[PDB]
């Protein structure tokens, strides 16, 4: 019989590859001792072998897929102007103002790539050839309740097309080659969110890896927009949640507890 | 004769790649309509060949480096406790403290990578084998005063290794051969900082590029560190300057006015 602090212990030093079965008999220093050698040999593996970083990893290779299929890789500021929020449809007389983590009086962490991606595609357009295909991969902030699969600092693939091409069925198109390519299996569901419209979720499960929306929206005129495009915005920490078989997303995270979703903590 | 609105907006269409030595005596509007044509040309090549924003490309070329090299790939918070700041000798009436992007009471943006690092030399130190070598690249604040070589928002690398190896050549040998890698010519020069203590400073000129440390230094106390290390940290964005000969380092950001030194606002 173990407490709820041994338990909570031996949990974080588990690992998907582990075997998890039958309770044993083994006292609790002798379990804790057998995991840390596990995961002491994980992280050593992992050393002698690729020494890349599971989320890194796959923000290399999100990047590469659309870099190769024709979008534009992106760049743009994680500290944004609380107007873009503002200019979004979120105001703060809003349950959803409440997630914005603020900086100074004016700035903000970006909850969403949407704005700088609008921003981005507005410009875009005086240069381009039709169809403009960019993309963004980069941190992203909300307030969340603690949960298994939310994260205060996450990192959001977001890419879209603008001009010809923006059907749904493209939109779906995309989203299928992406998930066939990290290997993932998921159903679309019809949805809506009060920013974008109806939207297209793409689930795993119950688990949403993101929202998807066939523009035009009333929002463009916002935004300088009056093409019609199409995008989706995934959580890479969710996708990576998904590949690894980890049950809280935050062996999936930016992290000082966890690399790779092997517990730094490996003293007894 | 220009006014100096007029000379601003013909300064930022200007690119290295363009020809800058006499005054024409063209009329603005069209000496802003050639540059913008070339701008816009300069973009359609990007998105016709390559399509990779040059910080995201460097960023996996140096990620390459390291890990081809033996140093394990780090993801680390970029949102931090402001008591990491404090430990690292940066209390709250010092001048340094002014630069710090506080975020809600406890929290701030990491001005740089050291912390963290540390942090994962200790815990790492339970699991890998001599020398440990170590390396994160992302995301860095502070508020600065408006420059040409500074950002508020820019990116740090911080490579570190701890154990055996850890010599002053052996820190200049890391750095050269990784400035060599990049085409960068350098000179190191002598200084200090009162968090570090005494440093070598990577010269481009008149440019820093990075400051290193040999340790140990005291202050590794307060960090559970008692193991010899090396370590240096630099800027990507002025990489990117001395790379691409940008005079302004606005435009190697993350922004939504330059994309590949490029501006985007392309109107008239
Ligand atoms: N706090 C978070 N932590 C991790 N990933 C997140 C978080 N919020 C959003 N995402 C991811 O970003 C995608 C697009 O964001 P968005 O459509 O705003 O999410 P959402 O509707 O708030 N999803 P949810 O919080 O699961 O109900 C989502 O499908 C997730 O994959
Ligand atoms: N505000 C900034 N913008 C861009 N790069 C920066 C900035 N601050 C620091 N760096 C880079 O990060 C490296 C390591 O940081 P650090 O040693 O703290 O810089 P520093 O001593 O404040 N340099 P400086 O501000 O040029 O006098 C520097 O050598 C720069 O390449
Ligand atoms: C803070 C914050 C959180 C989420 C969003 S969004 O618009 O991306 N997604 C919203 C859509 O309305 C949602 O799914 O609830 C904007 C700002
Ligand atoms: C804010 C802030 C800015 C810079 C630093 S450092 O320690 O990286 N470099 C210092 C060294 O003391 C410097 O070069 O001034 C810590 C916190
Ligand atoms: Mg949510
Ligand atoms: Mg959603
Ligand atoms: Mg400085
Ligand atoms: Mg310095």
Same mark, same amino acid.
């Given at each position: 019989a173990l407490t709820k602090s041994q338990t909570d212990r031996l949990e974080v030093l588990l690992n998907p590859k582990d075997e998890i079965? &039958?309770?044993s008999g083994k006292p609790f220093r002798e379990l804790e001792s057998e995991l840390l050698?596990?995961?002491?040999k994980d992280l050593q593996q992992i050393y002698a072998e690729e020494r890349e970083n599971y989320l890194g990893k796959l923000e290399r290779e999100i990047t590469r897929f659309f870099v190769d299929r024709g979008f534009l890789e992106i760049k743009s500021p994680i500290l944004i102007p609380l107007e873009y929020?503002?200019?979004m449809g979120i105001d703060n007389d809003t349950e959803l103002s409440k997630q914005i983590f603020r900086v100074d009086k004016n700035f903000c962490l970006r909850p969403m790539l949407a704005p700088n991606l609008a921003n981005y595609l507005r410009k875009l357009d005086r240069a381009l050839p039709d169809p403009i295909k960019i993309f963004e991969i980069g941190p992203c902030y909300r307030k969340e309740s603690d949960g298994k699969e939310? &994260?205060?600092e996450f990192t959001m693939l977001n890419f879209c097309q603008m001009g010809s091409?923006?059907?749904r069925e493209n939109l779906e198109s995309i989203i299928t080659d992406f998930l066939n390519h990290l290997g993932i299996d998921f159903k679309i569901v019809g949805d809506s969110c009060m920013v974008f419209g109806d939207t297209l979720d793409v689930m795993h499960g119950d688990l949403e890896l993101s929202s998807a929306v066939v523009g035009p929206i009333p929002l463009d005129r916002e935004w300088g927009i009056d093409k019609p495009w199409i995008?989706?915005?995934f959580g890479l920490e969710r996708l990576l949640k998904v590949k690894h078989d980890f049950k809280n997303i935050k062996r999936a995270a930016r992290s000082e507890s966890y690399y790779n979703g092997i517990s730094?903590?490996?003293?007894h």
């Open positions: 079965s &039958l309770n050698s596990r995961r002491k929020i503002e200019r939310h &994260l205060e091409g923006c059907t995008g989706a915005g730094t903590n490996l003293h």
